[PDB]
Ligand binder design. Structure first.
Ligand code: HEA
Ligand SMILES: CCCCCCCCCCCCCCCCCCCC(=O)O[C@H](COC(=O)CCCCCCCCCCCCCC)COP(=O)(O)OCCN
Ligand SMILES: NCCc1c[nH]cn1
Ligand code: CUA
Ligand SMILES: [Cu+2]
Ligand SMILES: [Zn+2]
Lengths: 236, 100, 58, 48, 117, 268, 124, 535, 363, 56
């Protein structure tokens, strides 16, 4: 979804993977807030009680039971955090039956999309190019540095598998709401998967540096119904 | 590892062998830096040690440390009712009676 | 004398009154060319690194 | 001559030009150098 | 540059440590070629005299003002570090005794004095 | 410290070096080398007689450091039993850093050896690139290095038993057994059929056996400066810190060569 | 009496050659049995050794915290004034206007976007 | 001629540290003005100062990173505090190899010239701090710009290696009569531990940059995927240096804080042996984790698991140091002098900066925070508020002992408060911008991210005024600094105890646990004639 | 999963190696008892199974470390030094056998075997003590147990939280008669002999020759561990292309030459290189000989990996069982240089026997 | 009696470690039952209503 003006927290999710990511982050924040509160409280006690005091306890310097209790407690926190992280890492992926393939080639300062299916006997394969609409040519109501002239169209409730490469330099395919972020190196093919649960318009931007115009390279994904997808694919 | 009955003997022995004011203040300063408040017997030796070295400010500043070491005010007023004949023979006056 | 001048140059580098790199009567031949060519090399890398900022090529 | 103004490369007392000029110039050059580069590269590519 | 020494009793400076010369056709030894602070050590280890001491300070007896521990120093001051009479009880406290005042070690109480050599 | 006159000599066994001008001059030579090489590769210079001045000045500055390092140890006489140990620790910590520039190059060969890219047909040394046969001149080099390893221990055991003729011959033979290695490895770059730019195999094979060449010219220089300083009676029977360093450098390079011959010349 | 009386307002002004004479006169006056010391001597003895002079003064006095606070305020009011000058003189793109940020809202409403917390492109 | 034999042809270790400091000030002012240039263009949407040039913006970022990672923090923390204090604290006259120290200094000023000349002789070098291979080629940056910037990373590497060798060789065989390797102060341990990582990390970076240069100029085809190479190799060969590097900047800081916590809180450090073991463990577990900078390149599913586990384990040792510092401050008396304020501001802000790091080590969560302003907000709390605060504390702590002139307390406090407010206002909203989806390295941004960008551009103008006040503080220190020791009792190194009378305190004033604060007001050129003695 | 067996073997070898070097006749009491335990475990895995002896033998190290920590009497220390042989034998044999069982491809087996055997000479380095004199030694080994648990959770969650046959044969008596098995056993045994004799007698000769200092004694022998690590890791992947017999032969030659060259050195700087050579050659021999044993048993026998690796572990343990006392007895009787010369020529003369393992006959 | 005080710092430590943890758990039991759970509930109720329209 689109960024909000005074944002404080994540964008809205449209895929199970981003929901798992949000749940994991909100799980870790628990222990992080606990530790920060403990440290701040001890600093407050030190400032409020022992500030410019007459008695100095210069003979408490060793400790033996207490030193085992700030080396075992933090370990348990790390294990508790690491359980759900490993479960999420191994569980979520394209276990069964991917349903579509879209090649997203990243050239210097624009994008190229190819649909690996819908092939005729002669190689009629549907493909197009996505550029950024300049500020001078914008119509009333369009977003600046995020609106394109050609946008990817996909159905709802269908697994989409993205194969990402590059032709000039190292790029990054990123749509925040969908939880998709892979690189595009010049000599390998990377792949991810996404499932969209609701209809709408989903915006994204590049991440890795590529040169002069790194800030004008948006990505726009629409999730139309199946009837509209069938009509659109029979027009291009 | 040290017990109360060994602390309150070792510091008596140390207080009975100071020979100058620097040593008296050294022994007092390393005594009020433990978890144990000094017993009334040790402070009885401290005042005689401050009398042998001939110092007045140290005999009054000792009583101003018990007020900060003791947890409550009843204990402070109980320390001042057993160390009363030592005070009224030497002549030591507390700070709140001088208004320095 | 013989090949053992080591017991004669050890009475010279002690009590010399000059720095140890210019005490023997041979350091001229080592130190004149080096210090001479250094001031040419360092003056040739500052004429081509200010001439390159202005866009001039050869 | 060991003393409080003996391990400094520069002179701070008994000086013809006051120390304020040398002190100010150092920070002025330091905070003005990274604008000359921007000016040069802006005037080498058309834009103002 | 002057007469050569034979033991460390006849060494009045760096002028007595040049040495004779080796002979043509032999690998010279260290009694025939050493000049500076290397021949002093060689002349000291041939007798049993160590020229560079490495012995820590005395940690056997305390120090009173009447009977202070005497540290030997070739200058007017020497930095002395105290760790206690058992020699590892007191923490480390550093003192600078001088030929006009004595160090006193605020925690244990040992006093130190200078023997000026 | 109660010897009679001990205040006339230094009271601690360490070196207080006199002021020298060489650190600044080496830095000024490196600045000129860096700027001139960074410019000459893209025009702006034209003539290539400036980079040679920069290199010659850098090497001359290093030699002039070593002069003052040798006049302070054999004539002035300030190298006690502490400073020699410090120098040994220093040389070890430099050799260790010099060994870890080779681990990176080995890791850049195993990261492409196992898993070669699609572009090159999946095969090491690829089609159209004939490797160097490991039963030819690249074995005489190994035999020469192993022989040189033994010819230098006969020189270090002849200066300890007080034999002069027997320490000059060993060093001469060792010096002539590192010149034949360089000659053999300069005729194996003229009888080759693959250049630096025809593969990733010609870019790492000429980048691990070319650093060895530069590292091994230094052996010839160090052995020449060890023969010339023994002809003139600079080394005693128990104070020789130049032979020990030049022997700890030969063994390390032999061990390194015994890894560039099993991972580069046999395995393919 | 004048030498010792009211030492709380004169110690820090006397030189260092009139301070070692008062101390060297109270060290031969404390050897006498106590209860023979006047009250002024008792006050002087306490002020000389344990008192709020010399190495026992406070790091921050009452008239220095005000100085720090009113220096920080004058250091935050200057940055605000310098940043204000760079805010009136800005390049305002055409998109950042209210009548343009209300048209984008209709588009984001037709294509249902941010069903959760909110969508709003209006920041004047 | 006596000038040339004491400040250009030098051997004394303590007369080079001042030259490090005077260089660090210049190289830290340059970067700060370049940072203000960045934050003035990311204020409101559009093209405000730099008219339309997206080049000259990435150049500013690269020149701002290099000037303060290699020319400010390292010289300040290894040259002015390492060279000057290690020999005095271990009891040695001078270093073992003085000429190497002189060359280690003098290789830097020739290295600043190359960097400044890589930003004027053409469009520039807009490759970022990490010069990734396929952008830093001959097709996107075509000129003498990247080449002259890779030669500024070789001279600095040579200087760092030559200093590290000297530090390791001096701490082993130049100690006093009775100082074994268990009684050294903590600062010397920190310098030794950082000097070992400098030896074990730099050669890999040197090899990587040299291979990049060869690929650029001699068509060698290491990182070109049209001849059988992969760019990812460079990333490996860089990040082996990347993670040790960020620890080299922080280990020397930690030790300094210990001394402060030991001085103004009159108590010894809680468990010194624990601190040395923790520093060793932090140093060793910083070499086995270098792939968390590269999670989205396409690594396997069995390598992410190892790298998430091996990164969180570092939290165990640093917690020990934090809790030991709290235990040191707990029981003792606290007086709020200028160094102790900076010490307090480091035990809280470093925690905030590091606790975010356990949110970014997870492999699952790195697909939402990578190449986003969250990472930026992360590392400013631990670099700008973790290293610079430690350097300021060290300066305010040791300046009177080195120079012999004192400084005004009120102006130092004002500067500290301004820096605190500015840095806590400029780096906090970056977390929000990162969470909402703002990528890194973009001059112009969508209209949505405007508001917070106007708040983070206001703190920088508060911090630069703090820098100017620092300049005036130094001016007031140098001129009329002798008469600024009677204004406040901040001058006193230790406050008298409860029973310690003033007259006895004036006779026995300095009570220390190191040789550092017992030397004369300006230290003598030759400090130790007869050896020091320890029990 | 596949990673779990690798991690278990690595941890077991690391723990055994780092418990062997606790600062604290007795030493040679651990190996010999372990030898007596070696064949028996090989029988149990044929019937009982792998993981049961793995756990019952992984817990014995924990009980032994408690025994070391608390007890101080001579008999108590003797008991503590015992029960390491049985536990170590069970753990190593079971782990290596199950690693061979899990990985069936030859190249994958070689790579995994090299990476796993890299643990030895790593425990000596990663943590030399374990529960040492000072409490802070549980402040350096503390960060590593956490990593071990965090890396074992990956093996656990992957196997029994996620996606979800017995044979008999290979009598030990029949297997002992096969010449190639004996060839492999001797190849391991002699290389073990060399380092076993070299390790204890070196410090005495160094004190006699140069008055070696305490720190120099430890620093001299350290590089052998790094050489072992590098050699094992490299050749576990590099040996398959060249044939394992060539790697074994070259390692034997290099170890013999390096051991011979030791007496000629008259300084520690000279001693640095030969130790590295010896470590590299031993890594050669181990990484080349361990995988080939399973290949031989697959080629000429039925697929059971108990008795064969029991024979291998007997070969390893015989080196430390006998040779320290033998080396000491030879020392002061014939001379240290003579001892190294004898071992070097013996190892070199053993070299030609490696030609037989190149192309073993079919079953 | 009232003239025998032995341990007071330890009780302070135990009171300052048993209150910096209860307070911390208080400020962490609000992030998981007032900031996270209602968001999940709202998200689910949105999806159990966008589907009923499609079913109808
Ligand atoms: C100089 C400061 C510094 C330091 C010291 C460190 C060290 C650490 N860094 Fe490093 N880091 C950087 C600055 C720094 N880093 C920079 C600049 C980068 C690269 C940026 C770029 O390339 O663009 C980088 C690399 C980097 C990344 C890569 C980000 C990415 O691109 O995906 C990450 C997170 O993944 C990270 C986090 C950490 C952590 C957790 C530590 C740990 O050392 C911190 C641990 C501290 C704490 C955890 C305090 C614990 C307090 C206690 C009370 C213990 C309680 C116990 C627990 C909480 C269990 N760092
Ligand atoms: C990169 C390689 C750098 C190599 C530096 C020398 C490595 C050995 C260092 C060493 O122990 O010897 C130094 C001599 O080195 C030298 O004289 C040469 C060091 C400088 C080489 C040129 C640097 C270019 C970069 C001592 O030097 P010293 O004079 O301080 O020893 C004081 C005399 N008692
Ligand atoms: N004896 C343990 C040292 C060693 C042997 N092999 C490798 N390292
Ligand atoms: Cu293109 Cu980024
Ligand atoms: Cu990192
Ligand atoms: Zn003491």
């Amino acid at each position: 979804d689109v960024p909000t003006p005074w944002g404080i927290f994540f964008q809205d999710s449209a895929t199970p993977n981003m929901e798992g990511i949000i749940e994991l982050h909100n799980n870790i924040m628990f222990y992080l807030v606990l530790i920060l509160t403990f440290v701040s409280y001890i600093l407050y006690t030190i400032i409020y009680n022992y500030s410019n005091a007459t008695i100095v306890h210069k003979y408490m310097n060793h400790g033996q039971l207490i030193e085992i209790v700030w080396t075992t407690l933090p370990a348990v926190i790390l294990l508790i955090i690491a359980f759900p992280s490993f479960i999420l890492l191994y569980l979520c992926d394209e276990v069964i039956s991917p349903a579509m393939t879209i090649k997203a080639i990243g050239l210097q300062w624009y994008w190229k999309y190819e649909y690996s299916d819908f092939i005729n006997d002669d190689g009629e394969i549907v493909e197009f190019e996505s550029y950024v609409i300049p500020e001078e040519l914008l119509e009333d109501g369009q977003l600046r540095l995020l609106d394109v002239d050609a946008s990817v169209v996909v159905p709802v409730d269908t697994h989409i598998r993205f194969i990402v490469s590059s032709a000039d330099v190292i790029h990054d395919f990123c749509v925040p709401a969908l939880g998709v972020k892979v690189d595009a190196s010049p000599g390998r093919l990377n792949q991810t998967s996404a499932l969209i649960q609701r209809e709408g318009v989903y915006y994204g931007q590049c991440s890795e540096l590529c040169g002069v115009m790194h800030s004008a390279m948006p990505i726009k994904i629409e999730a139309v119904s199946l009837y509209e997808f069938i009509n659109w694919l029979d027009e291009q | 590892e040290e017990t109360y009955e060994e602390f309150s003997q070792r510091y008596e022995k140390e207080f009975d062998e100071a020979y100058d004011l620097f040593e008296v203040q050294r022994v007092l300063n390393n005594c009020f830096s433990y978890d144990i408040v000094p017993s009334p017997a040790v402070i009885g030796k401290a005042l005689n040690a401050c009398r042998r070295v001939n110092d007045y400010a140290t005999a009054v500043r000792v009583f101003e440390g018990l007020k900060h070491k003791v947890e409550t005010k009843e204990q402070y007023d109980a320390y001042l009712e057993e160390l009363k004949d030592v005070r009224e023979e030497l002549g030591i006056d507390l700070k709140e009676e001088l208004f320095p | 004398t013989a090949t053992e001048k080591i017991i004669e140059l050890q009475k010279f580098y002690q009590s010399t009154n000059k720095p140890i790199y210019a005490a023997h009567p041979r350091s001229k031949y080592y130190l004149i060319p080096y210090f001479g060519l250094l001031g040419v090399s360092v003056a040739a890398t500052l004429f081509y690194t200010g001439r390159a900022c202005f866009g001039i090529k050869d | 001559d060991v003393g409080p103004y003996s391990n400094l490369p520069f002179k701070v007392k008994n000086r013809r030009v006051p120390y304020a000029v040398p002190h100010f110039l150092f920070f002025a050059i330091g905070m003005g150098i990274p604008f000359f580069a921007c000016y040069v590269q802006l005037k080498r590519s058309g834009s103002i | 540059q002057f007469k050569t020494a034979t033991s460390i009793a006849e060494v009045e400076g760096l002028e007595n440590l040049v040495g004779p010369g080796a002979k043509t056709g032999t690998v010279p030894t260290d009694l025939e070629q050493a000049t500076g602070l290397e021949r002093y050590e060689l002349l000291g280890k041939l007798e049993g005299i160590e020229v560079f001491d490495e012995t820590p300070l005395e940690a056997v007896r305390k120090g009173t003002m009447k009977d202070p521990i005497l540290i030997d120093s070739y200058d007017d001051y020497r930095y002395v570090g105290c760790t206690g009479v058992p020699a590892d009880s007191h923490n480390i406290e550093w003192l600078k005794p001088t030929t006009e005042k004595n160090a006193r070690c605020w925690e244990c109480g040992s006093v130190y004095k200078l023997n000026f050599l | 410290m109660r010897i009679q006159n001990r205040e006339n000599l230094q009271l601690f066994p360490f070196h207080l070096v006199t002021n020298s001008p060489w650190p600044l001059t080496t830095s000024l030579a490196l600045m000129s080398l860096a700027l001139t090489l960074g410019l000459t590769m893209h025009g702006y210079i034209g003539n290539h007689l400036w980079l040679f001045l920069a290199i010659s000045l850098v090497l001359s500055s290093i030699f002039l450091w070593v002069r003052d390092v040798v006049i302070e140890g054999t004539y002035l006489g300030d190298h006690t039993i502490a400073v020699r140990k410090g120098l040994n620790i220093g040389f070890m910590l430099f050799v260790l850093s010099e060994i870890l520039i080779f681990a990176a190059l080995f890791w850049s060969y195993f990261h492409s050896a196992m898993g070669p890219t699609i572009e090159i047909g999946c095969q090491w040394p690829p089609v159209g690139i004939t490797s160097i046969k490991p039963t030819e001149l690249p074995l005489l080099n190994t035999i020469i290095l192993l022989a040189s390893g033994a010819t230098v221990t006969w020189a270090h055991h002849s200066i300890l038993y007080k034999d002069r003729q027997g320490t000059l011959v060993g060093l001469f033979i060792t010096t002539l057994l590192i010149i034949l290695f360089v000659g053999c490895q300069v005729l194996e770059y003229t009888w080759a059929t693959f250049t630096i730019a025809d593969s990733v195999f010609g870019s790492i094979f000429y980048a691990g056996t070319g650093l060895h060449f530069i590292h091994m010219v230094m052996l010839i220089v160090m052995l020449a400066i060890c023969y010339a300083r023994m002809y003139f009676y600079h080394f005693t029977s128990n104070h020789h810190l130049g032979l020990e360093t030049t022997i700890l450098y030969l063994h390390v390079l032999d061990i390194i060569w015994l890894f560039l011959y099993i991972v580069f010349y046999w395995w393919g | 009496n004048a030498t010792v009386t009211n030492l709380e307002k004169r110690w820090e002004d006397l030189p260092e050659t009139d301070q070692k004479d008062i101390i060297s006169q109270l060290s031969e006056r404390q050897k006498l049995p106590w209860k023979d010391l006047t009250l002024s001597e008792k006050k002087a003895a306490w002020y000389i050794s344990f008192g709020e002079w010399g190495p026992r003064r406070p790091v921050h006095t009452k008239e220095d915290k005000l100085y720090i606070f009113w220096g920080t305020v004058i250091g935050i009011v200057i940055s605000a004034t310098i940043f204000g000058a760079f805010r009136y003189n800005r390049n305002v793109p055409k998109t950042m206007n209210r009548e343009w940020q209300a048209a984008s809202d209709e588009y984001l409403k037709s294509k249902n976007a941010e069903p959760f917390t909110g969508y709003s492109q209006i920041q004047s | 001629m006596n000038y040339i034999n004491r400040w250009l042809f030098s051997t004394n270790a303590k007369d080079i540290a001042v030259l490090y400091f005077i260089f660090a000030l210049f190289c830290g002012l340059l970067g700060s003005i370049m940072s203000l240039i960045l934050r003035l263009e990311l204020s409101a949407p559009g093209n405000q100062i730099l008219m339309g040039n997206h080049q000259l913006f990435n150049v500013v970022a690269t020149a701002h990173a290099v000037l303060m990672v290699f020319f400010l923090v390292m010289p300040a923390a290894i040259g002015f505090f390492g060279n000057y204090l290690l020999p005095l604290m271990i009891g040695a006259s001078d270093m073992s190899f003085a000429r190497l120290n002189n060359i280690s200094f003098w290789l830097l000023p020739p290295a600043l010239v190359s960097l400044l000349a890589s930003a004027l002789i053409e469009n520039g070098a807009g490759t970022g701090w990490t010069v990734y291979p396929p952008l830093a080629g001959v097709q996107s940056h075509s000129g003498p710009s990247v080449d002259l910037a890779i030669f500024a990373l070789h001279l600095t590497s040579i200087s760092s290696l030559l200093g590290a060798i000297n530090f390791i060789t001096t701490t082993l065989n130049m100690r006093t009569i009775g100082m074994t390797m268990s009684k050294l102060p903590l600062f010397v341990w920190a310098v030794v531990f950082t000097s070992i990582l400098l030896l074990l990390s730099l050669p890999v970076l040197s090899a990587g940059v040299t291979l990049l240069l060869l690929d650029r100029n001699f068509n060698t085809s290491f990182f070109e995927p049209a001849g059988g190479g992969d760019p990812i190799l460079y990333q490996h060969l860089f990040w082996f240096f990347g993670h040790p590097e960020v620890y080299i900047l922080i280990i020397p800081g930690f030790g300094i804080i210990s001394h402060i916590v030991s001085t103004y809180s009159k108590k010894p450090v809680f468990g010194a042996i624990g601190m040395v073991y923790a520093m060793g463990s932090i140093g060793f577990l910083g070499l086995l984790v270098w792939s968390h900078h590269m999670y989205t390149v396409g690594l396997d599913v069995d390598s992410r698991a190892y790298f998430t586990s091996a990164t969180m384990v570092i939290a165990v040792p640093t917690g020990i140091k934090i809790f030991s510092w709290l235990a040191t401050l707990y029981g003792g008396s606290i007086r709020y002098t200028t160094p102790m304020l900076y010490a307090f501001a480091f035990l809280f802000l470093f925690t905030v900066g590091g606790l975010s790091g356990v949110v970014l080590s997870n492999a699952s969560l790195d697909i939402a925070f990578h190449d986003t302003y969250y990472v930026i907000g992360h590392f400013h709390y631990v670099l700008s508020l973790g290293a610079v605060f430690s350097l300021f504390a060290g300066y305010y702590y040791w300046s009177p002992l080195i120079t012999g002139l004192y400084y005004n307390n009120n102006l130092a406090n004002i500067q500290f408060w301004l820096l605190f407010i500015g840095t806590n206002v400029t780096f906090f909203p970056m977390h929000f911008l990162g969470l909402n989806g703002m990528p890194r390295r973009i001059p112009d941004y969508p209209d949505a991210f405007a508001g917070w960008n106007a708040i983070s551009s206001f703190g920088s103008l508060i911090s630069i005024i703090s820098v100017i006040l620092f300049a005036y503080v130094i001016y007031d220190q140098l001129v009329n600094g002798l008469t600024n020791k009677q204004l406040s009792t901040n001058s006193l190194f230790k406050n008298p105890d409860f029973i310690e009378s003033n007259i006895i305190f004036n006779d026995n004033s300095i009570k220390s646990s190191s040789i550092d604060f017992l030397l004369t007001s300006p230290p003598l050129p030759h400090t130790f004639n007869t050896p020091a003695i320890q029990s | 999963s596949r990673k779990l067996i690798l991690f278990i073997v690595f941890l077991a070898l690391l723990l055994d190696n780092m418990l062997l070097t606790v600062v604290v006749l007795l030493f040679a009491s651990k190996a010999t008892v372990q030898l007596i335990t070696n064949p028996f475990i090989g029988l149990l895995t044929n019937r009982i199974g792998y993981p049961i002896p793995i756990f019952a033998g992984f817990c014995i190290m924990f009980v032994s470390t408690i025994m070391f920590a608390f007890s101080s009497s001579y008999a108590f220390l003797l008991i503590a030094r015992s029960l390491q042989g049985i536990g170590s034998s069970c753990s190593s044999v079971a782990g290596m056998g199950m690693l061979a069982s899990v990985y069936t491809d030859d190249e994958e087996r070689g790579n995994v075997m090299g990476i796993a055997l890299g643990g030895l000479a790593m425990g000596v380095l990663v943590g030399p003590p374990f529960g040492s004199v000072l409490y802070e030694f549980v402040g350096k080994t503390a960060p590593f147990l956490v990593l071990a648990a965090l890396v074992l959770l990956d093996g656990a969650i992957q196997l029994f939280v996620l996606q979800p046959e017995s044979q008999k044969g290979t009598p030990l008596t029949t297997l002992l008669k096969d010449p190639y098995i004996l060839i492999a056993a001797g190849s391991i045994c002699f290389a073990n002999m060399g380092i076993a004799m070299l390790e204890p007698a070196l410090p005495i000769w160094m004190m006699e020759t140069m008055c070696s200092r305490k720190w120099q004694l430890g620093v001299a022998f350290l590089p052998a561990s790094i050489s072992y690590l590098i050699g094992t890791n490299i050749f576990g992947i590099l040996a398959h292309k060249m044939g394992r017999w060539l790697c074994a032969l070259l390692g034997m030659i290099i170890v013999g030459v390096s051991i011979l060259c030791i007496p000629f050195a008259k300084n520690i700087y000279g001693l640095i290189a030969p130790n590295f050579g010896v470590g590299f050659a031993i890594g050669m021999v181990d990484s080349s000989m361990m995988p080939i044993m399973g290949y031989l048993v697959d080629l000429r026998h039925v697929s059971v990996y108990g008795s064969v690796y029991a024979i291998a572990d007997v070969a390893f343990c015989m080196g430390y069982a006998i040779g320290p006392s033998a080396g000491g007895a030879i020392a002061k009787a014939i001379g240290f240089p003579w001892l190294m010369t004898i071992i070097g020529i013996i190892d070199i003369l053993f070299a030609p026997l490696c030609f037989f393992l190149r192309s073993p006959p079919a079953k | 009696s009232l003239t025998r005080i032995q341990g007071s710092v330890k009780r302070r430590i135990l009171t300052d470690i048993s209150v910096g943890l209860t307070l911390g758990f208080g400020f962490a039991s609000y992030w998981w039952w007032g900031v996270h759970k209602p968001t999940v509930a709202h998200r689910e109720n949105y999806y159990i209503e966008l589907a009923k329209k499609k079913k109808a």
